[PDB]
Amino acid sequence: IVEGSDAEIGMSPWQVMLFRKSPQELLCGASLISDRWVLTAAHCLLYPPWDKNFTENDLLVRIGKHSRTRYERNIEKISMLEKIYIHPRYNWRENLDRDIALMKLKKPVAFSDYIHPVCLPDRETAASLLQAGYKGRVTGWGNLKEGQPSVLQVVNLPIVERPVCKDSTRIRITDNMFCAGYKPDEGKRGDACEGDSGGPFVMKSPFNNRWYQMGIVSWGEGCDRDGKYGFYTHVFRLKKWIQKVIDQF
């Protein structure tokens, strides 16, 4: 996270760390949506241009952590993964369209004060909240500039108009993504950086006070560049794929 701040303890109880098994290396953010399903970005698992094709064997997730350094005894958990599911129409070649992946935990995790699932956006929350000018929140342990934090970092960022997202890049953007971040003339900064990929973009509903995950940190041109915006997988638009996978398996 760039230009964020330290999270309060338990501020993001749905946070998940995606590690490569060996050498043990922090790869990405992720999010807990139930006692055994974790949401992340497909490109955290499959990106050929970096010779990246992980399987369930290669990875672990750590849940409930707060300080990347400190080992939080009796607070943090570790889970191997049973299977991973990349969206079939994931398009890594052209534009990272449908940058979304599900990971099933080998054994379910126990909820606690520090481990709690986020909501998937329903149709009503999606229509009221996912609008330009409304701010969401991004969290992760990625780089602080384009420099690794101890404690989870958090930043709030507004959603940007779709025409403005399109004109910021040559990439062919789709309705399965949205972009967020401040504009150069709004005098505030902030963005997700590498390491933060696959982490959640959440918004708190004023209707019922729950937090919903509207986005997955997907791509951007560097980090926190003027006139550039973070791009986020549009979680609600891929909810039926999420639901078809979870019911199936």
Binding site: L120, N156, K204, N209
Partner: peptide, 30 residues
Amino acid sequence: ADCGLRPLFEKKSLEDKTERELLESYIDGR
């Protein structure tokens, strides 16, 4: 049916340090 409600904040009627900035963007942001 318990998603989105944080043990250490919503469940304790405690507000985190920056969530108000989000609520206010619903007023000012459009």
